RNA sequence: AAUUGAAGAGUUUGAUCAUGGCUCAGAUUGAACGCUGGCGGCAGGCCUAACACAUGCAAGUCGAACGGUAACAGGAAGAAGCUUGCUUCUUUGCUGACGAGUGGCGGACGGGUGAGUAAUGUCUGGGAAACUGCCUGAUGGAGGGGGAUAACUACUGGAAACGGUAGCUAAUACCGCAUAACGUCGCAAGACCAAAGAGGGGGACCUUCGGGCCUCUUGCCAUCGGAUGUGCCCAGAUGGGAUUAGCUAGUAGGUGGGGUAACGGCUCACCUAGGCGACGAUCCCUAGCUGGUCUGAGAGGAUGACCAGCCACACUGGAACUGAGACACGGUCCAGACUCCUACGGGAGGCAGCAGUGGGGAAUAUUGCACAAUGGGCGCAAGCCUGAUGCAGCCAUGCCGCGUGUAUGAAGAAGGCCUUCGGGUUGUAAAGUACUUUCAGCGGGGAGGAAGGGAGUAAAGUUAAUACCUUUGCUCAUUGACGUUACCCGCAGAAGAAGCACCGGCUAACUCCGUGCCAGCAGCCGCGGUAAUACGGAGGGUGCAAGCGUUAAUCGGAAUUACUGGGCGUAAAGCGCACGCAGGCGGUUUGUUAAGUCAGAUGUGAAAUCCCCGGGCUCAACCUGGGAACUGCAUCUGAUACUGGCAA
């Protein structure tokens, strides 16, 4: 029900940093990125069309830490909502509670944020939410409880929040350790390199 | 006999009762002439918990319909407004 | 008013009764073609004024025999 | 079978007997009427009709003949005597 | 706001293009099987043998209808050990109550199953010739008598089941008599038709001093309405077969008699000789139908498990009786097959109610708890009953959610596998280090489903009455099966928690070793006869994940039945050619109609489900509010271009 394995291996099959070990240090430096996703990893794949579509879907799931039935349900919900299904799908992945806890700098990675969410260290709107996939509405206040406030992790995580780009659709404020999800993220406000038409076309075959 | 009575429709350990007008010898969740309101015994402490069409109820009691103890209690709860 | 139909007499020979074919003109559900379609009805008439080949209006009443739940109102267009 | 179905069995037998007797007397009076119409007798059949009328109305009221049937009888028989008289 | 909706590929050939079949990639399921398996929420769970059933429950209730007392607990009276003050025993239905019985009501509901039924069914829309317990409104009546019969007692038959005979008693049981309509018959005149009391309380009066009498509540009867439910009719629609073309004598219609609640060949007598049928009758095979479900871009195709509406069935075949309602699942009668008891004379039974067995099968669950809620029956109510229902148990059967940690960590450790022996890879993976405690485990706290019901008051109404009863407030104890509930807090420690398939192409993911046309694999193409990316193992990777594969089944892809949306010179496909009936289509102008067509309105298209916008469960699944939708049918109002009818 979640991955639990070598993370930088997943980041190495995709060829791109999936932010799976954000943590203390800088850019990887001990990953052997691009070089060998397994034993025959030095081989160029010469990847197919199914391979590029598949590999795009796997990039997105392995970023946000979602498995397939849950992702597939996000595609059905993004499909039925009015508008653009790629952009709706990223809006559904960005409203996840573990993601919003990661974006605010409360967790160093999304797995650490998922353990903060999971171990009842996070309230939304003054109610404790235990669930990684809670869908944070706009104009909500998500914060850390009094237990697990001033624990080392979150402090260190806010320390590495300043190294990243400070997302526009949040009120990050780390003094009180509370945040406000203000609006839904625009497609132009996130990541610029994921090709969601490939995963629309992957599920539409 | 036609009866204005409750009919259990929510999930397990979470009932939602719909007050209907049925021929009394039907099943509880079976055939009804018309539904006329509802009663959620939880709902939350928000706004309603219960709405209930008093004009149609007065119509059926004018016709000769009987009323169970809960529906009488709900009409005694929502008296005219509260 | 009353609901009535129009049709033509298809046969005659029965003892104060008649039988009338009705032509309903209905679209085919799959193919979208308007197709003629009959409905033969055993119709009552007191004193059997209408003969074969007529055109007669017809209304529904109580049962008068087996099938026979239809009775004429007006014989038109008898022309031989 | 072991219930209050035993009581309904014995009551329905008792009421079967009672109803069979009253139904049989009613039918014999009606046979008096249109067995007097079999011969060409006007006032004899009128006497029999006056003899059957209270019992057929009465068995209609008691609940074993369901009064429309009651009506039919007297209606049919009235027709017979004014077919005759 | 409520349709944002459509993918291909492999294989005919030396190669090609086309045709064309086969096959794969998706979604789904009441699933089964194999390997594996942590928790929870919500659902689902005999698809086969409508096979046979042990055992326990599944329909009772009312003494405020009645005679009554079998118990239980009191009361009165008597007698006794007598502690002259408490026990023991006895007569009394005197009382709260109540076994058995009569009687009223319910056992036609609820619950099960899908055998039969291809149209006496179902769906949609009309209709007329109807009945309707309980419930409601209105108008009125509710007077006066009689004979019985259970129970009971006494005999008595029978092994039992079950009876018989003779007496006794009651009623809201039964029967007359009176009374009689805006009721039935009748054109009228007229004729005729019913009933039942019980309970609470009481000032005065009368008491045969039991109670009359007054008042209230409730019940009875009659008629007309209403509501609900049911019966009947019509039209359209709802499988396959023409290698099934004729079927039908109560058959088709009429008149009259009878019958039903009601029309009707429903039935009978007579008369006519019809009726149905290629727009598919009749026969045969199959089948419960629908809202819906699955698939689909859609049109369609398949299906109709759960949930809900309708029908049918209740061991098998038939029949009626009682009743408002049945031709009756836990009723009667007969017959039959099976099973059982027997004293051999005869008797008894019916899980397709809920659990459960045996069998059958690839396959499907507990002989649980409670009536606390909702509903039902009875009752004035209290309450009693309820295997409906609420819940719990078992099962990864499905859907949904969460977990198996998190960060750091290069000596790129050891070991495995490969190696062009340089190294590479497993791999930040592990170990180390630093944190976190979800869920499981342990200990505390603790909502909500609980509204009612009972006991006292106070006021109002009624009344002769400050009683009784009804209604409304107020107060007082209370009413939870689930249930060591949901949820909250604290404890200890990463501590209890990852498999399954695949890796030649389709199709994401590669090498080594073993085997050598073998062993074996395989959905199709096809691999294997010595260096096999296809077999078996290992390392590595890929996909899914408490699941994963295989199998079965459906739709898709399949434009390979083409209505949307195909073809026919040579690929399959133009009758050998004509004439022609039924059928389909029909030049051109004007007028009328308005059937098709179009527009609007109204009634209906059950609720749930799908869709949209919201709301509640920490979220989700789930539940839910409002709308849209249900593409239809009927009627009315219009328009008249096109098609049809009619006239020229």
Swiss-Prot record, chain A:
It comes from the Bacteria. GO terms for molecular function: mRNA 5'-UTR binding; mRNA regulatory element binding translation repressor activity; rRNA binding; structural constituent of ribosome. InterPro entries: Ribosomal_uS4 (IPR022801), Ribosomal_uS4_bac-type (IPR005709), Ribosomal_uS4_CS (IPR018079), Ribosomal_uS4_N (IPR001912), S4_RNA-bd (IPR002942), S4_RNA-bd_sf (IPR036986). Keywords: Antibiotic resistance, Repressor, Ribonucleoprotein, Ribosomal protein, Ribosome biogenesis, RNA-binding, rRNA-binding, Transcription, Transcription antitermination, Transcription regulation, Transcription termination, Translation regulation. Pfam families: Ribosomal_S4, S4. The keyword Repeat does not apply. One of its GO terms (biological process) is cytoplasmic translation. Part of the 30S ribosomal subunit. Contacts protein S5. With proteins S3 and S5 encircles the mRNA as it enters the ribosome, which may play a role in mRNA helicase processivity. Some nascent polypeptide chains are able to cross-link to this protein in situ. The rRNA transcription and antitermination complex (rrnTAC) consists of RNAP, NusA, NusB, NusE (rpsJ), NusG, SubB, ribosomal protein S4, DNA and precursor rRNA; S4 is more flexible than other subunits. Belongs to the universal ribosomal protein uS4 family. This is Small ribosomal subunit protein uS4. It comes from Escherichia coli (strain K12).
UniProtKB/Swiss-Prot annotation, chain B:
InterPro entries: Ribosomal_bS16, Ribosomal_bS16_CS, Ribosomal_bS16_dom_sf. The keyword Magnesium does not apply. In addition to being a ribosomal protein, S16 also has a cation-dependent endonuclease activity. Coiled coil: none annotated. Induction: Part of the rpsP-rimM-trmD-rplS operon. This is Small ribosomal subunit protein bS16. The keyword Nuclease applies. It comes from the Bacteria. HAMAP family: Ribosomal_bS16. GO terms for molecular function: DNA endonuclease activity; four-way junction DNA binding; structural constituent of ribosome. One of its GO terms (cellular component) is cytoplasm. One of its GO terms (biological process) is cytoplasmic translation. Belongs to the bacterial ribosomal protein bS16 family. Part of the 30S ribosomal subunit. Transmembrane segments: none annotated. Keywords: Endonuclease, Hydrolase, Nuclease, Ribonucleoprotein, Ribosomal protein.
From Swiss-Prot, chain C:
Gene3D superfamilies: Nucleic acid-binding proteins. Keywords: Antibiotic resistance, Ribonucleoprotein, Ribosomal protein, RNA-binding, rRNA-binding. One of its GO terms (molecular function) is rRNA binding. Pfam families: Ribosomal_S17. InterPro entries: NA-bd_OB-fold, Ribosomal_uS17, Ribosomal_uS17_bact/chlr, Ribosomal_uS17_CS. Disulfide bonds: none annotated. GO terms for cellular component: cytoplasm; cytosolic small ribosomal subunit. One of its GO terms (biological process) is cytoplasmic translation. NCBIfam families: PRK05610.1, uS17_bact. Belongs to the universal ribosomal protein uS17 family. One of the primary rRNA binding proteins, it binds specifically to the 5'-end of 16S ribosomal RNA. Also plays a role in translational accuracy; neamine-resistant ribosomes show reduced neamine-induced misreading in vitro. The strain missing both S17 and L29 grows very slowly and has a rather unstable temperature-sensitive phenotype. Part of the 30S ribosomal subunit. This is Small ribosomal subunit protein uS17. It comes from Escherichia coli (strain K12).
UniProtKB/Swiss-Prot annotation, chain D:
Signal peptide: none annotated. Part of the 30S ribosomal subunit. Keywords: Ribonucleoprotein, Ribosomal protein, RNA-binding, rRNA-binding. One of its GO terms (molecular function) is structural constituent of ribosome. Binds directly to 16S ribosomal RNA. It comes from Escherichia coli (strain K12). One of its GO terms (biological process) is cytoplasmic translation. Belongs to the bacterial ribosomal protein bS20 family. Disulfide bonds: none annotated. Residues 1-24 are annotated as: Disordered. The gene is rpsT. Pfam families: Ribosomal_S20p. One of its GO terms (cellular component) is cytosol. The lineage of its organism: Bacteria, Pseudomonadati, Pseudomonadota, Gammaproteobacteria, Enterobacterales. This is Small ribosomal subunit protein bS20. InterPro entries: Ribosomal_bS20 (IPR002583), Ribosomal_bS20_sf (IPR036510).
């Amino acid at each position: 029900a979640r991955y639990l394995g070598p993370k930088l291996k997943l980041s190495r099959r995709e060829g791109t940093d999936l932010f799976l070990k954000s943590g203390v240090r800088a850019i990887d430096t001990k990953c052997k990125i691009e070089q060998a996703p397994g034993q025959h990893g030095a081989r160029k794949p010469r990847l197919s069309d199914y391979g590029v579509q598949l590999r795009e879907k796997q990039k997105v799931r392995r970023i946000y830490g979602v498995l397939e039935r849950q992702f597939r349900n996000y595609y059905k919900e993004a499909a039925r909502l009015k508008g653009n299904t790629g952009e709706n799908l990223l809006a559904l992945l960005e409203g996840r509670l573990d993601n919003v806890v990661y974006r605010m700098g409360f967790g160093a990675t999304r797995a650490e944020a998922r353990q903060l969410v999971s171990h009842k260290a996070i309230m939304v709107n003054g109610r404790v939410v235990n669930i990684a996939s809670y869908q944070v509405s706009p104009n909500d206040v998500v914060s850390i409880r009094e237990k697990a406030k001033k624990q080392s992790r979150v402090k260190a995580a806010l320390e590495l929040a300043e190294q990243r780009e400070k997302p526009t659709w949040l009120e990050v404020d780390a003094g009180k350790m509370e945040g406000t999800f203000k609006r839904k993220p625009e497609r132009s406000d996130l990541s610029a390199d994921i090709n969601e038409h490939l995963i629309v076309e992957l599920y539409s075959k | 006999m036609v009866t204005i009575r409750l009919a259990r429709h929510g999930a397990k350990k979470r009932p939602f009762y719909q007050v209907v007008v049925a021929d009394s010898r039907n099943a509880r969740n079976g055939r009804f002439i018309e539904r006329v309101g509802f009663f959620n015994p939880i709902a939350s402490e928000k706004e309603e918990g219960t709405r209930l069409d008093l004009d149609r109820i007065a119509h059926w009691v004018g016709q000769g319909a009987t009323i169970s103890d809960r529906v009488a209690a709900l009409i005694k709860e929502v008296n005219k407004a509260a | 008013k009353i609901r009535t139909l129009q049709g033509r007499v298809v046969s005659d020979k029965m003892e104060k009764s008649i039988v009338v074919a009705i032509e309903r003109f209905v679209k085919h559900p799959i193919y979208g073609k308007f197709i003629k379609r009959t409905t033969k009805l055993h119709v009552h008439d007191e004193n059997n004024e209408c003969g074969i080949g007529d055109v007669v209006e017809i209304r529904e009443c109580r049962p008068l025999s087996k099938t026979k739940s239809w009775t004429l109102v007006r014989v038109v267009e008898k022309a031989v | 079978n072991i219930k209050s179905a035993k009581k309904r069995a014995i009551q329905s037998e008792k009421a079967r007997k009672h109803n069979a007797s009253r139904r049989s007397m009613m039918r014999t009076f009606i046979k008096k009427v249109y067995a007097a119409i079999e011969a060409g007798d006007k006032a004899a059949a009128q006497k029999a009709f006056n003899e059957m009328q209270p019992i057929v109305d009465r068995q209609a009221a008691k609940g074993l003949i369901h009064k429309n049937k009651a009506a039919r009888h007297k209606a049919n028989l009235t027709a017979q005597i004014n077919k005759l008289a």
